[PDB]
Amino acid sequence: HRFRNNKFLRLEPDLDPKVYGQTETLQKQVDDNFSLLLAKHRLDMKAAAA
Amino acid sequence: VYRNSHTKRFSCRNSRLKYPFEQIWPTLQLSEDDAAMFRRNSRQFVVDLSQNITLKNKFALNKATKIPHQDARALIYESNLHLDAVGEHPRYLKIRRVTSQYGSKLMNVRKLRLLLGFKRRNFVQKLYEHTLLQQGSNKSWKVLCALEAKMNLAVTRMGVAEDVLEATHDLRQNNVTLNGSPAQMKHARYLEPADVLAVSAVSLIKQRICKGLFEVAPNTL
Amino acid sequence: NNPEDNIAIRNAPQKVFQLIGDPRSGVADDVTHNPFGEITVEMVWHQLKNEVYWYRYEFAGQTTEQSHRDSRLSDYTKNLIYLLRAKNPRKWTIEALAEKFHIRKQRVLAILALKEMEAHKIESGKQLQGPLSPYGLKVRVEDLKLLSLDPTGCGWVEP
Amino acid sequence: TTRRRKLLGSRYGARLAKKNRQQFERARVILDCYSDEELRPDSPPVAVKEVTINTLQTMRFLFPQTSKEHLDIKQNIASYKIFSLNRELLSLLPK
Amino acid sequence: KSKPFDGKLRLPDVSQLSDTITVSGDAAPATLNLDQKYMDKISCWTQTIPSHLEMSYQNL
Ligand SMILES: [K+]
């Protein structure tokens, strides 16, 4: 696997709690998971429709 | 009394130590020179062994882990020619006289005043008289129980104040309640085994704890 | 119930019966020493940056061991006490819960009161809000089963 | 010169009884208020059905091992939580 | 192709474990675990809580 260090294939680094806040970081992590699921539905619909 | 003896740096004085003062405030920040002065009470040089030893090492050499509370005085302030003073001629060993008790007894009473938050002597005297009438067989333990029953010391144990002095200021501002309402005779009463303490200045105390541990908090959540 | 893995069994009352003399002609109780213990002191910590020493006083230091465990029970254990009391108050009395978890009755009742207050805050919507919402769990007392470590080794069985 | 309003306190039970009577009744049964004759209330005890707990530490602080024992505990809690959410959802899905 | 979830909460009785192991499976410390990282700050009182007090940091 070429991405040895980037094991989770992330596009952006996790927010630093000391700068953005613990609550903000936790919300960001939840949003990231939902985006991955939403993108999956988004690719499938486009392929099926076009 | 705007003296130096009423500041944390010089609060406690002990004439039986190489450095007469003693540090008792766990959150006081000392300079490099001040730390060096206090360190002289911790390290001692042994001639025959040609090494430096610490107070903790001295206890280990004496095989002392749990000892009667009256026996710790002979370990902190005395020396022995077979464990920690080997190689010194007996002529130069220090032996105390019966005339040094007054300085020691006065020092310990000052310690009780400091722990309670710079209380007056009459305050301690009445506390001792109070315990004389309460039930119990061991006088020494009754005094200890009285100290714990004090409201300001209990607030310190909760972990919401840096020291007893900060806890006392919180009581004057009514930042802690007793049984749902602000306490009456808060500076003179004793707590009972079923009392409930709660913080009313929630926003203030939460900020205090967060700031204290901000530097020791991990950078990964 | 073995002393190796039962601190409570190690910290148990002792039955003392000591004698001096001849049981066939005359004996007397041995009262030359105190086998019941006394108040002790110990040095616990030394801060090398501020030169601060900490001393701990114990009422029964010579006849007890690892007394610091009682006040440092995990959050999982405390929730288990709270759930057992709610499930069956008839069997899970204060006496039974104290014996089960090797603590005192006063501690058991105090733990229940604090957990009850916290539950009201969660239900009212004052705690575990936003990203931490999923960690507020509502449990029906009927749908609760306690497993036991009956099989030797790793593994928990329902009965 | 303080803008802080005067605080007159009250016992926790006193405030709860006026805000949520159901929670107050449940607490009495849990806290063993019916065992002592002197403190026994006149009203009959109410049965306890549902309770709420916090599992943040048990999920992300206390069980790090990879053994089946630790994995099973986390899975059971997660499964039970989903059931609770689904029951709430079913109450609203019907038109 | 596995048994479906029954709908019940199954929690082990950790009260039957040996005293040499903590709840998390690690070795049980026989003495208070103090650290210089916390003993110089307001946390010094938290790490040395006595046995006659019950403190809750969720409700203070
Ligand atoms: K004075």
Model description:
- This is part of a larger assembly, with chains A (50 residues), B (221 residues), C (159 residues), D (95 residues) and E (60 residues).
- Chain B has 221 residues and is mainly alpha-helical.
- Chain B is built from 9 helices and 7 strands.
- Chain B has a two-stranded antiparallel ribbon. Chain B has a two-stranded antiparallel sheet with strand order 3-4. In chain B, strands 6-7 form a two-stranded antiparallel ribbon.
- Chain B is globular, with a radius of gyration of 22 Å.
- A two-stranded antiparallel ribbon of chain C has the order 1-2.
- The radius of gyration of chain C is 23 Å and the shape is extended.
- Chain C contains 4 helices and 6 strands; from the N terminus they run αββββαααββ.
- Chain D is 48% helix and 5% strand.
- Chain D has helices at residues 12-19, 21-30, 56-60, 68-90, and one strand at residues 50-54.
- The longest helix of chain D is centred in the C-terminal third of the chain and has 23 residues, at 68-90.
- Chains in contact: A-B, A-C, B-C, B-D, B-E, C-D, C-E, D-E.
- Chains B and C meet through α1, α2, β5 and α6 of B and β3 and β4 of C.
Radius of gyration of chain C equals 23 Å
- How much helix is in the residues of chain C? 25-40%
Written as H for each helix and E for each strand, in order along the chain, the element string of chain C is HEEEEHHHEE
Biggest sheet descriptor of chain C:
2 strands, antiparallel
Broad structural category of chain C: alpha+beta
Name the helix and strand elements of chain E from N-terminus to C-terminus, one letter apiece. Answer: EH
Give the N-terminus to C-terminus distance of chain C in angstroms: 20 Å
Q: How much β-strand is present in the residues of chain E?
A: 5-15%
The beta-strand count of chain C equals 6
Which ions and ligands are bound to the chains? potassium ion
* Global geometry of chain E: elongated
PDB class: ribosome
Keywords: mitoribosome, ribosome, mitochondria, polytomella, fragmentation, rrna, evolution, translation
Entry title: Structure of the mitochondrial ribosome from Polytomella magna with tRNAs bound to the A and P sites
Chain A: mS108
What is this entry, summarized?
The structure is cut from a larger assembly and holds chains A (50 residues), B (221 residues), C (159 residues), D (95 residues) and E (60 residues). Chain B is built from 9 helices and 7 strands; from the N terminus they run E-E-H-E-E-H-E-H-H-H-H-H-H-E-E-H.
Q: Topology of this protein?
A:
The structure is cut from a larger assembly and holds chains A (50 residues), B (221 residues), C (159 residues), D (95 residues) and E (60 residues).
Chain A: H1 17-20, H2 22-49
Chain D: H1 12-19, H2 21-30, E1 50-54, H3 56-60, H4 68-90
Helix pairs in contact in D: 1-2
Chain E: E1 9-12, H1 36-39
The complex binds potassium ion (K).
Residues 120-121 of chain B line the site of potassium ion.
